[PDB]
């Protein structure tokens, strides 16, 4: 078994677990870990998890620190568990998965992914570690990620971003765009064609196309005119309606970013996990206009435009299915007189 | 009785309690509430209150999310309790009142405000909800707020700002300026004429008059000259003295904002509740000048100027009474040779 | 003995302990102290220490609020304890020392520093308080700080910065540059000649020389050219290498500040205490380049340049000793063909 | 206000609060109070209450230690609060009442019982303390207890037992049998004629009549014969039926005591408060016979015999009302063919 | 450093720390230590100390389990710390001493007792461990315990009882009667002649002389007559007075034991540490007679008789000094007309 004091040694010296021998003295108190430096206690870990403090500490210390998929993607793919690593959720500050494989004896359900206990779980395999492509080849259920091709398998090209120590970025010195492969009950799946969410924050939103730059820079009707968007309810859906007490529309992250050029918004992330569609309590500071339970998704404007411009506006209301981050996302589409009234993610 | 799991359902779906039926699974641990999403716990409430976690969770979920008076105003008016709503203090992250009326069985002292238990409490009535103006008409003690007139009653026009989900603003799509009415022992009170504090933060202070814009933009003696303010100790009181080790003056929020154009201040809010007069430990980063227990109030400069220019400077020292946010605020006035030495709120 | 309720009185009125008589009512819950204002609890202290909540509260309330040395300096000098004051660590939010002298009965090992219990401890004496220079003169082990000269003793001129209520600055209205003196086993020490770290943060880094201004403003090879720095590996050590997956170099705080002009860095302070050499997990957001356990020190560029330009580059590798903040800091120096490969602090 | 350290002084010296001046040093940790004796912490209070540890400590220290009514009696009488004392529940280890009067500033709703806040509460007045009979005479709602007569008032003679520091006994050197008086809305009530429960434990049950001694000593049918009890279902109700998997009858404490002469019972007190009718999960160790939710009451056998022998057995089933400990207790009476089937308290 | 998991291994296998290599998996939660047995957590340590759970666990595991002096004796002798062992207080369930020597790195102030840090502490040395008699010979301050003689030193014969794993007994297969020696500031002390307390509990009190057997068996005046004790107030002091509401006398443990032959007493140990004189809140169940703050000491009756029969009864009141368990115990002696009124320990 792995000791607390040896986990602590690694953490105080390297900032994470690297398998160095040694021991640092430690104090558990207040659901935290303190090490003693010249007689004084200094906090090196605070447990925000539902696990026991020492177990949480170990899993955190064994964090995967390579670029890894964002958790929304792993969830959409049905990943239950990872092979011989810990995927750390930096949003929640807890492990992304309940159990572990060959990592920690308090959470292990197995030591290798080839065991029976893993058979019906979807295991994440990582093509960057020796042997794991071959384990995937023999696994019943699993998801494999790789940097390039895999012989005998058709790749699905993933999103451009990944997460590195909780910072989600598009790698330049490091590769963040993985190929994905999936197996269910021994059978290779054909992964669907997908849009990908863009994982941008309100606070530092950056456009990634000319369309988006135009959106942020041009006035509303000049933008709508230029991109032949009249009748697609962008003024409601994208720019948002702050005219009444109840906030209307405002379903694209880029719209929130544009409001933020003029004046602040308050977003309450009431179910704070990473996901393709987010749900916010939104309050507009300038007007006082607000709305609880507002679905927001961060697509490239161009992607969103192609979704909606491909829609049949003949019908009053229908639930539209779109594949995003490998998940089937339901949209509510309301039309009147052959124009769009609203179009939003159903959560 | 209301269940925890049903409170949780409402919160995970809508971000607050709306009376929908249903249940979400939940874990109480670490003075927090976690819901289970695909086998993993995610925090949906952290209890910063002195109440039991599940009770706090329910009250929070039943937060009033309409525009509501800032808590300093309710306190100054002697509000003990609200009728069939929960006023949430976003500064403290706890209920503004100890008990409740027709809201939650663990804190209820009554189900309707007409009961005997309420008779000697000052109940907040809200003219925007059916029937409550009439309950106020029959209440012994209470405070009523309304958007417009009330027949047979003289209104007091309140402050322009209110709070919406903890964001204090001047409503454009929503009404934040209430009329106030008050009853004590069955007798309608005549509310006094008042100044109102402006509820601005150091971090995003915005002027609300030409005088204030001038103050922020002009140099000290040019501003004092222009507004005929020589002899009113503005250089001490408003601009503040950072020349000695002990910080001097600096009693108006706008003065702190002006310092902040040049260089940072650190404010320790040591008794962190909302109130008309605040009390700070202030440290000036540029000079190292500092002062514990410093009274600061946020009045419109113009209002403050009229307070002080109406003062008799004949006497060495006297306690001056000014009505602000409906409270009687004591000021210490020190004069010498018929000019002002200092003039500050007494807390 | 000192009471909790009297500590609370002082804190709610003045923001710290000043010896006023009186009592405020209080509630201990959740490792915090709440006072009752008009029937509602408001938090006035949260215990981030390993001490019992009420003891921590008292020590915090008796915080030294004059300008005081940064804790890294006191540690480097071997200060164990302070005479009749509490040095508060604002980074850790806990006392800097384990025990106390004439301050608090739960942590006191003595009431005056002249007692036997203090004999083998290095006591901090403060020349600004009546009598303490004379106590130092008779102490076995101690460190004395003063604003000016001390008769019969050679001064060591300290760093220009000190800390005032946790804000570290160079005093203009207040003196932050102390003279230091030290005694070990009754014998006055001759303190070594030292560089001093500059205690600047990444977030608000400000240059303090023309060299540093040039560094931040000029392009790399233009800066290296101008200051005749070719062959001293500044491109690695100072500007940092973000070309590979593993981040290289980047050992001077000023280098991190320059990166930050272009794009954000994430620093994980994994052992969060104040010290001369810090240790970070660094992640570059633009490239995804990262490195755990990275030593960073904040020297004036000019100081660092003189350290390294005085080095013999004849040898492949050697451990170099430099005195900084009174500590002997080990540097690893690697050379090839008579140029510098890398030069970094050894932690 | 009263200080923690002064409460502690009284407790370590006298074992409770007596108003002595002084201070003992104290540590709050783990919801407990520790005092320091020669450098080592010793626990002097553990908080089993829902109140903050320091508040609970004070109330406990101000425990009424004179003989006082058992809490079941005060509850049955509707006592909400006590005048200038704290009634401590030794079963629950918490105060018997929510608020307090002239005792502790964190729980006080008033300082004297004559105040408006007390007007609609039933206040316990204690004729043994100067002035309180007269306060009762002027109170709107209250209960008065005295050792002897009160002029102008008809007494109700209470139970023979009272509680002294949590030990319930029949006083020989001290008076435990109080006279009771009650006022509702200014009007003296006529208290009903009552039986009283006997407050005996299974573990040390002692008979208090010849009938009870006979019951414990004689064989079943010899006892039933002697007291002409055939047809009153004592074999079921009192002796209990352990023949089947579900335990039957066994509703009188004395019956449990008799079983205990032969072999052990396990009683789970699942709602552990003091009350006239208790509710137990009972398991018989000899047979394995068991029953959840079993009502048990401790009456003198003679009293119980008179209740039931005065019943009309003509009807199949009826709810019978009996006054016990001043409460109206409902009994279910089932008869067949003019004999009793069962007769038990309805909880 | 010593690891948590290795402490756990020793505890689950041997019940305490014996220096075996190995590791058991562990969970810290709720201020307790749980080990995992076949997937289920079982508690192996609950922390009743003020130390961090893992530190407390280690010290407890390193409990001295040989016969050791009762803690009252070590305290009376001024023992601050033990040499290379942990004296566990089983009454308090915590270490008897604050710091440690060569035992645990979180509490060590030294690794060997010969170090400077120990110089002014009174160290307990244990003659049963190799080398420690010689360490005592060179120590400045200390207390030595041995089974037999020590060359060149006069022994003081200790009490017959010692403690073995918290069970205090008179050894038959093991030696519990130590010789004591003491050094202060390098100088061997002559320990005074002493009585010893007998460390008996009320619950299982056993007489240790014919006098005590007579006391328990004979009637009061027959016992007083037989031992010529008239005029020494035994009826008050020893047998106790239960006639009034306030309990009188009852200062010898043997008296409490005799009451207990007739009927139960409730003792509240309000300052629950081991000491020569104890302080109880006593309640007599039969009479209801009670008394807070009652001093009780457990001497052999014969010893107590010789104390008092050697007293001069000429004076009304005087404080008498008696040496017991090496401490100077003050007694209050009150006389009238040349007989004893009362004689009791002053705490």
CA distance B130 to D193: 49
d(CA D65, CA C195): 69
CA R_g for chain A? 23
Q: Do D40 and E270 touch (CB under 8 A)?
A: no
Relative to beta strand D179-184, strand D187-188 is antiparallel
DSSP summary character for residue B227 = T
Chain E residues touching D169 at Cβ < 8 A:
285-286, 288
Find residues 148-167 of chain D whose CB sits inside 8 Å of chain E. 164-167
D231-264 core/surface letters (b: 16 or more CB in 10 A; e: else):
ebbbbbbbbbebeeeebbbbbbbbbbbbbeeeee
Rounded to the nearest 10 degrees, the angle between the axes of helix D210-217 and helix D253-262 is 40
- Which CB contacts under 8 angstroms, 24+ apart, belong to E257-263? E257/E200, E257/E202, E257/E205, E257/E216, E258/E215, E258/E216, E259/E284, E260/E202, E260/E205, E261/E216, E262/E286
Find, among D153, D148, D122, the residue nearest to D137 by Cα.
D153
Question: Phi and psi (nearest 5°) for A127?
Answer: -60, -15
Chain-chain contact of E54 with A27 (C-beta, under 8 angstroms): yes
Q: Is B109 on the interface with C (CB under 8 A)?
A: no
Contact E105, E63 (CB under 8 A): no
Q: Hey, what are B70's tokens? A: 């800032």
Place of tokens 């997956």: C245
Nearest Cβ partner for E245 among D167, D169, D174: D174
Which residues lie closer than 8 Å to A220 by C-beta, 6 or more apart? A234, A235, A239
Interface test with A, best of B165, B171, B206 (most A CBs within 10 A): B165
Tokens 């040591």 belong to residue:
B270
* Other CB atoms within 10 Å distance of the CB of residue D49: 18
| E strands, B162-271, in order | 162-164, 167-169, 179-184, 187-188, 265-269
Please tell me which of the candidates B29, B41, B65 has its beta carbon nearest to residue A292: B65
H/E stretch holding D309: helix D301-309
Residues of chain B with CATH 3.30.160.820: 1-65
User: Longest Cα pair distance anywhere in chain A, in angstroms?
Assistant: 76
Q: Identify whether the C-beta of residue E279 lies closer than 8 Å to the C-beta of residue E347.
A: yes
Q: Which two tokens stand for residue B101?
A: 């009326």
The answer to whether A3 touches E3, Cβ cutoff 8 Å, is yes
**Interior/surface letters D90-109, b for 16+ CB within 10 angstroms, e for the rest:** ebeebbbbebbbebbbbbee
E52 touches chain A (CB under 8 A): yes
Using CB atoms, list chains with 3+ pairs below 8 Å to chain C: A, B, D, E
Instruction: Copy the structure tokens of residue C294.
Output: 């990275």
Cα separation values, E295 from C143, E231, E342, Å: 49, 21, 12
Record: contact A169-C243, CB cut-off 8 A: no
**How many CB contacts within 8 angstroms connect chain B with chain C?**
85
B109/D contact by beta carbon, under 8 A: no
- Residue C48 contacts residue C63 (beta carbons within 8 Å): no
Kind plus residue range of the DSSP H or E element containing E187? strand E187-188
Resolution (A): 2.6
Decide if E319 contacts E332 (C-beta within 8 A).
yes
Chain E residue nearest residue A29, CA to CA: E52
End-to-end CA distance of chain D: 42
Task: State the DSSP code for E275.
Answer: -
Q: Inspect the interface and report whether the beta carbons of E292 and D40 lie closer than 8 Å.
A: no
Q: Give the integer Cα–Cα distance in Å for C225 and A173.
A: 27
Taking every pair of Cα atoms in chain B, the longest distance, rounded to a whole number of angstroms, is 76
Give contacts of B117 with chain D, Cβ < 8 Å: 120
**E97 in contact with chain D, both atoms CB, cutoff 8 A:** yes
Q: Looking at the complex, does the CB of residue B209 fall below 8 Å from at least one CB of chain C?
A: no
Q: Who's near B130: CB < 8 A, 6+ residues apart?
A: none
CB hemisphere CA count around A50 (13 angstroms): 19
Q: What is the DSSP string of A213-245?
A: HHHHHS-HHHHHHHTT-TTS-HHHHTT-B-SSS
Residues spanned by CATH 3.40.50.11580 within chain B?
Answer: 66-191
Here the tokens at position E210 are 């014919």
Among candidate residues D62, D97, D182, D251, the one labeled active-site is: D251
Residue B149: how many other CB atoms lie within 10 Å? 11
Catalytic site includes residue C251: yes
The angle at the Cα of C292, spanning C288 to C293, to the nearest 5 degrees, equals: 145
CATH architecture of D1-65: 2-Layer Sandwich (3.30)
Q: Is the CB of C117 less than 8 angstroms away from the CB of E117? A: no
Q: Is D291 marked active-site?
A: yes
* Structure-token match 């037999």, residue found: E148
Contact of A55 with C291, CB cutoff 8 Å: no
Examine the residue annotation and report whether E291 is marked as an active-site residue of this protein.
Answer: yes
Q: CB contact, 8 Å: E13 with chain A?
A: no
Radius of gyration of chain C (CA): 23
Maximum Cα–Cα distance for chain C, whole Å? 76
Q: For residues D330 and D345, is the Cβ–Cβ distance under 8 A?
A: yes
Alpha carbon distances (Å) from D174 to D16, D128, D129, D170: 20, 12, 15, 9
- Find, among E340, E246, E262, E327, the residue nearest to E294 by Cα: E246
What is the DSSP secondary-structure string of B69-137? --HHHHHHTT--EESSSB-EETTTTEESSSSEESS-TTTEEESSTTSGGGTTS-EEEETTSTTHHHHHH
Cα-based distances in Å from B62 to B85, B131, E56 = 7, 20, 43
Give partners of D (≥3 CB pairs < 8 A). B, C, E
DSSP symbols for B189-200 = --PPP-B-----
DSSP letter at E203 equals: G
What is the b/e burial string over D10-19, where b = at least 16 CB atoms within 10 angstroms of the residue's CB?
A: bbbbbbbbee
Which pair of tokens denotes residue E265?
A: 């007493």
Tokens of D182: 């009650």
Show the tokens assigned to B13: 């779906």
- Tell me which residue has tokens 């019956």: D255
Using CB atoms, list chains with 3+ pairs below 8 Å to chain A: B, C, E
Contact criterion met (CB below 8 Å) for A140 and A156: no
CA atoms of C275 and C347, how far apart (whole Å): 10
Give the DSSP H or E segment for A184: strand A179-184
Which helix H or strand E contains C14, and what residues bound it? helix C4-14
Q: Which helix (H) or strand (E) holds B259?
A: helix B253-262
The backbone region for B277, taken as left when phi is positive above 0, alpha when psi lies in -120 to 50, beta otherwise, is: beta
> E66-191 — its CATH code?
3.40.50.11580
Query: How far is residue D69 from each of residues D76, D142, D143, E100, measured CA to CA in Å?
Result: 11, 15, 12, 51
**In contact, B311 and B333? CB cutoff 8 Å:** yes
How far C63 CA lies from chain B's nearest CA (Å)?
Answer: 12
Q: Which of E277, E219, E285 is nearest to E247 (CA)?
A: E285
Q: Which of A182, A183, A251, A258 is catalytic?
A: A251
D285 part of contact set with chain E, CB < 8 Å: no
| d(C-alpha B6, C-alpha C223), whole Å | 65
Partners of B109 on chain D (C-beta within 8 Å) are: none
Angle at D75 between CA D69 and CA D81, to 5 degrees: 80
CB–CB contact C16 B286 (8 Å): no
Strands A88-89 and A94-95: antiparallel
DSSP secondary structure string, D51-98?
A: S-HHHHHHHHHTB--S-B--HHHHHHTT--EESSSB-EETTTTEESSS
3-state secondary structure of E175: coil
Q: Which residue from B282, B318, E248 is spatially nearest to C14, judged by alpha carbons? A: B282
Q: Report d(CA A214, CA A301) in Å as an integer.
A: 10
**Helical (H) or strand (E) element with D308:** helix D301-309
């Amino acid at each position: 078994h792995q000791s607390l004091e040896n986990v602590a040694y690694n953490v105080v010296n390297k900032g994470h677990f690297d398998g160095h021998a040694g021991e640092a003295p430690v104090s558990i108190i207040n659901n935290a870990v303190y090490t003693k430096v010249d007689g004084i206690d200094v906090e090196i870990f605070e447990n925000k998890t539902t696990l026991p403090v020492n177990v949480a500490f170990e899993l955190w210390a064994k964090r995967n620190i390579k670029p890894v998929p964002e958790i929304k993607i792993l969830n959409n793919l049905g990943v239950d568990i990872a092979a011989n690593t810990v995927i750390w959720d930096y949003k929640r500050e807890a492990p992304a998965h309940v159990s572990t494989i060959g990592v920690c004896t308090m959470t292990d359900i197995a030591k290798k992914p080839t065991e029976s206990a893993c058979s019906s779980l979807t295991v994440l395999f990582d093509g960057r570690v020796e042997g794991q492509v071959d384990l995937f080849r023999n696994a019943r259920n699993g998801v494999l990620i790789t940097e390039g091709s895999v012989k005998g398998l058709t790749p699905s090209k993933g999103p451009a971003q990944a997460s590195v120590n909780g910072v989600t970025l598009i790698g330049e010195s490091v590769k963040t765009q993985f190929n994905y492969f999936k197996k269910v009950d021994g059978i290779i799946q054909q992964l669907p064609e997908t849009y990908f969410t863009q994982s941008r924050d309100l606070e530092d939103f950056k456009p990634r196309s000319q369309m988006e730059t135009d959106f942020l820079e041009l006035a509303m009707d000049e933008f709508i005119q230029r991109y032949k968007l009249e009748g697609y309810a962008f003024e409601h859906i994208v720019y948002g309606d702050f005219s009444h007490g109840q906030l209307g529309g405002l379903h694209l992250m880029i719209g929130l970013a544009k409001r933020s050029q003029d004046s602040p918004l308050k977003l309450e992330d009431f179910i704070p996990m990473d996901s393709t569609v987010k749900n916010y309590f939104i309050t507009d500071a300038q007007t006082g206009s607000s709305k609880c339970g507002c679905s927001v998704i961060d697509l490239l404007l161009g992607d969103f435009v192609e979704i909606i411009k491909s829609q049949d506006l003949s019908v009053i209301s229908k639930v539209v299915k779109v594949t995003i981050d490998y998940a089937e996302i339901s949209f509510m589409l309301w039309c009147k007189d052959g124009h769009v009234e609203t179009f939003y993610p159903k959560l």
